[PDB]
Ligand binder design. Structure first.
Ligand SMILES: [Ca+2]
Ligand SMILES: [Ca+2]
Ligand SMILES: [Ca+2]
Ligand SMILES: [Ca+2]
Ligand SMILES: [Ca+2]
Ligand SMILES: [Ca+2]
Ligand SMILES: [Zn+2]
Lengths: 321, 289, 291, 291, 289, 321
């Protein structure tokens, strides 16, 4: 109470803001035709690096900042339920940013939304302003971006099922420019979805395959991992969704073996490999963070690689060698 | 909220050749003729505004034909519209008639084609991007048969659109690049020019969209040298070149009015080439030489 | 009316910056000409310009500039936004002048403030802010000052507005053609004033960037061999580059992401005379790919 | 509307058949592509197709599939009709999957049941069910299963509906052109998918019939003499036949009454490469009469 | 108070030349075509009345094209209007279409262009005087492309104006003078004629505004002598000359119908020249000789 | 809202105060006999230097901290109006200090007023306390000093028109001791004046003249500039009122030329000089700040100097050389 040597109308700067977030139970109810879920999930931490215009942290705006739900990155918990249904319609959708940082911090954090599910980046701070659905604040403050929800059922689907403009509501994205190099705030999402048409459960595994020589890569299932380097010397996959996985990787080298590592944040808990001839196989129980890499290095004449990833817990350990 | 534009602009010159059922001037029912505000072929003017938005909805849409040709001209021009953006197009003059939305007249007379507007927002997008059935209101086309072989008339589009949801401006230039050697070519921005031939000997680009441009062509040659020429309805107004071994650069202010090619042909041992094109005017003249 | 389109939007003006122990009006830019409210002015309205290039007349219904801090809470000093109805009057030189402006707003750099300029009821022409009498074509002048603070980027200035545009016309050029000579001094410019010409020697060519953003530049000139010396004497990033230089003829194309008010320099020139700049606005994936 | 025609009708889908001690979804056909509800799909809508070939868009107002037993009252087992909104999702593999479908109907083979699929309010395109994104063009997917029964024809499945069609266009081809090579592997198809190509060897040519009915087929290919070996490896009747075969060039035309999902086989081939099928639908009095 | 005139009068003949996108007959979008009552180019009749007033406001404004040419003529004529009095004009036929106010037809047919009148009084003034954006409603223009090379049609202006505030009559003659040597030339009054060449050898003036005039040309020669000739659509009806050393005088009653020049050509060693022009009729014939 | 681990009665220190100042339109109205103006103008920035007892910034308390109005330093805008009148009477008069600085700053800023228009300085912090009209605060705070207004018309006049005690209401002044070396706050003045007796407009130029040998210097007009050094080698004038001027300087040296510069904050925009014999003349278009110097150096045997200063804008540039 009571602030020194001040006239009213003054605005007084504190040194830091604490906002307190508590756990939130989900609400289900059936609107006669639809099941309706309200819940709050954790999107991602929002970081910036110094002297960079850092868009979506590292990453950049791709196809798993697409709203559909069914999207492990945006809706970790909801994915499981949504797999049991054929189509969805968002009622309310809000992204909320809770500062991680004190008010001497400085810089800008901004949240944006665009209806073009596969809208490219805002290229710089000036472009970033042109969005219709934008929130720009100091990193030490709190804010929230409300996404306009339309009134049309679209299919619940992984981003590898025809035109993303048909299945996804839009795209979420953030930017941090100026400012320090740090983790600036939490990004939560509050939502209310209606799910329609119960069906037999969609699979929640990932199947990412490349050839070599044809140069195309094909993905089915959820985008847990992404393929970043082709090569015949190296194979690197990148974690898009933090968590523990049991990944199975099979490929065609010409003899030699492989050298696995986790560049970035992550640990390998249980390796097993068998590599020879023109066939190699590596199955592992990894825990990994967003934008970390699982690299298979020291390869020699490697074409044709396929990855199978499923969510597990650390204790689903590989036991042979 | 939304903005609403009402305007009339230039589509293309409608030509026919003798003894030939000739659709879309010989291009065939391409991707060029899909109705979408980011498509500079039908909307050279609108595209500047559409670049700033995400969605569109047409409220009114007409195409118009105004004769360049005189009253003793034989023949037929027809304007049509199919709701299916990737409709094949008609083969004979009898199939041409089955369209719901058609206008046939003598080539020396005016006619309008009124296309049915629906009530669904679709995405403003480059026509070779999303599912054409999802993003385009449909395709527009024309046919000219029973002689002669001339540039028959001008075609205008007249519309009223609502544009929704502002976004950062989609690029209003073209960046078309090819190697040579990998046979792949990537286009960025509006499809003003296409790349037609890429040999070590010659380099030609076809102008799809009529108007005045500033172009920057840069390529990897060896010894190089080059010779600019506009094949057809075109004109170089201001020219600049610099050509040595390894790399050469051409900068020009040109005006194209039909599918005219511009050719860089004196080339010896060339590979990578890139085109930059942007809608300009004649007083944006190159002046260095 | 129904040749009348009406736009409501919020876009990016500029970054408000200060230098330590200086007044610094408009980031030190100076010539209060590219701060005239016409729109059309790609400095104030970088998003509206693509639309207004297609029209002859404009009327603002509401117009408001907004300052959002980039700087932290312990920062000292003061930023100020002002507006004069006379787009031709010179800026404020001292703080005493700044305070007499009828439409002024000042707050400490870590806080948010805004300025609402008053709109009248007259249609004016969308034109160059150099294409005739300022008082006939511009609603007025905008500007900012930052004093007694540190030397840094203090905040972003946005503009929010609702305009009516009238009378569709063929598009004004959305690119820049900037020509110079040598042998003369004449410096004719055509199109938007994205870049300006600081000096054209025979040793060096310097273009200063009046408008933040990503571009694709084509610069062409007459020297006597040499050339290759490109650099950004400000905050920017030559994201893609192509050069070719021989005798009395050389050419440079590049995909720079210039910003605030940076700089473009061609250093190793030797015996240069004629020169010309071609600027268009692009993203980065419009990247040059030949070398 | 008045480019809008509205049709109400009941036509023949297919015969529902089972094999003893098997699951047997869609008679064992497999590729859940020719069971997409577009209409246009000559499997589901063999009567509507002649109309819908003249239009660009469709909207279903009511749609219902009906099972009428062909089998007697002591027959054991169970038939099941299902519908998924996602025309692209794979079929049910086990009975457990079958049961989770929201729109499902199961009854013993000697009884009558029916399934009412729910119609929405959106216009979609009449197209190939291979001419682009399934979810954009198809209302959904239909399918059936017959388990724990005998191995026989259990019943007829009819579809009853009321559609609006919109936008008259020039007619989509009501015939089939199916080409193959040798020397290659490319197998381009054009028109309705009446027949499919199982194998093109050099010894044998086998076309499987996806659509029950009476046809007039023209098959043409390149061998090195031989040819004459026509047969129906299913339920059907070559009602009329004409053959001619010499060197690298032979040709077969015939008025088959193929059905359920029968087969067409050219056996005695020798050194065959290119081949092409031409299918049109006809009666039987369209009988070939030259030999 | 105010007066209100409704009238129709002659603007200019609209011509095209073959294989050429030809605007405003070749003059280019000049100062001539600014819409203002004191501008004898668009308002040869109104100008007599406007001379007596200070301000004007158009209530109605249309331009009209009536074909001089027959039905087998190919081509295009377009009438346009831009609100910006100093609009550059269109470069190609595609930019031409972007105007809000345009009319394109076959050259053998009638067409009208209705220009939007606003509600602001502006000053009646000579068009090269005040800021063109302040004093002119806008510019009118025309283009003719796709052949042939003829005088295609007549152009009329039809309007209704309110004129405000009477003033002493602005001069209804021209006084164009040049020296020679100083390169400066001063015009006074209506811009009927322009001075095109001023050498010691020859002296030509171009008639901008169609009609019949009486002209008085006087110049400083040395020994002099002179030869009158009208280059193009023109005619001398009545001629008088007196030419000695030091100074000579020409008085003529002429009729001009397009941009025709009249040439005084036999000159030897000439400098200062002045032209006096006034709208007359044929029976105002010169009779002394 | 809500402060951590606190009992009521606590006083909580923020880290900085933002006060927001907006533009203020002037109000005119006639009290039957007088015109009455209410407005807010910018006096000066208030700075202190470290380890100094800094009184009136550099300067020191002279005759242009005198209240009269008619005083360019105290009333930039009002001067123009006041020139059209013969006498004035202040109704309300308040000086307001708005902090420029955060609350870790420390030191003291003080505002004082004294009726003796030509009261000398407070000599030290102890003397500064003895004023009756004083406000002492921390530099990070806001405050205002209300000047007692009497009820007597006095003449509107520049400080060079007889006894300053007759024409000026009093003297304003400030002090900053202890504390850092920085610009601490803005000083605004809010006022309501009555102006009486319309007359033909008083001149608003400056005429400052010195001789040499007589040693006296005489000023007419406004105190924009002041003469600081006599000399025969140098002439330095000092800006008392920030702004752009067209200054004309004429003097008697013995041949030689002159070397102009602006020591302190300021730039010269357009010079012209002609210097010879026993006469020299320099006219310039300068922009200058408070307490900067316009020096004419490299002089040689210089007696007798006169300055003419008028306010201009930068574009009134001298065009000859
Ligand atoms: Ca977008
Ligand atoms: Ca079609
Ligand atoms: Ca002013
Ligand atoms: Ca499914
Ligand atoms: Ca214009
Ligand atoms: Ca005292
Ligand atoms: Zn508090």
């Amino acid at each position: 109470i009571a602030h020194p040597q001040a006239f009213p109308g003054a605005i007084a700067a504190p040194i830091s803001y604490a906002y307190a977030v508590k756990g939130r139970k989900p609400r289900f109810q059936t609107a006669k035709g639809s099941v309706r879920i309200t819940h709050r999930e954790y999107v991602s931490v929002l970081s910036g690096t110094n002297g960079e215009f850092l868009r979506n942290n590292g990453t950049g705006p791709n196809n798993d900042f697409s709203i559909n739900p069914l999207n492990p990155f945006l809706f970790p918990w909801l994915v499981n339920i949504a797999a049991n249904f054929d189509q969805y319609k968002f009622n309310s959708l809000r992204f909320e940013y809770v500062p991680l940082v004190n008010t001497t911090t400085n810089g800008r954090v901004a949240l944006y939304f665009d209806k073009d599910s596969e809208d490219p980046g805002p290229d710089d701070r000036a472009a970033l302003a042109n969005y219709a659905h934008l929130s720009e604040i100091s990193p030490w403050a709190i804010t929230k971006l409300t996404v306009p929800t339309d009134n049309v059922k679209r299919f619940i689907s992984d981003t590898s099922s025809g035109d993303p403009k048909l299945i996804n509501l839009g795209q979420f994205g953030w930017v941090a420019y100026s400012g320090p190099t740090a983790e600036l705030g939490d990004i939560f999402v509050e939502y209310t979805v209606d799910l329609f048409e119960a069906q037999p459960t969609s699979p929640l595994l990932e199947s990412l395959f490349r050839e070599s020589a044809s140069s195309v890569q094909t993905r089915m299932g959820l985008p847990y991992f992404s393929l970043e380097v082709a090569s015949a010397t190296d194979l690197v996959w990148q974690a898009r969704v933090p968590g523990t996985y049991v990944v199975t990787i099979i490929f065609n080298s010409t003899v030699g073996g492989l050298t696995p590592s986790i560049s970035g944040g992550g640990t390998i808990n249980s390796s097993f490999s068998v590599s020879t001839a023109g066939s190699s196989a590596y199955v592992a129980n990894i825990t990994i963070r967003v934008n970390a890499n699982l690299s298979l290095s020291g390869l020699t004449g490697a074409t044709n690689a396929q990855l199978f990833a499923v969510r597990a817990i650390t204790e689903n350990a590989v036991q042979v060698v």
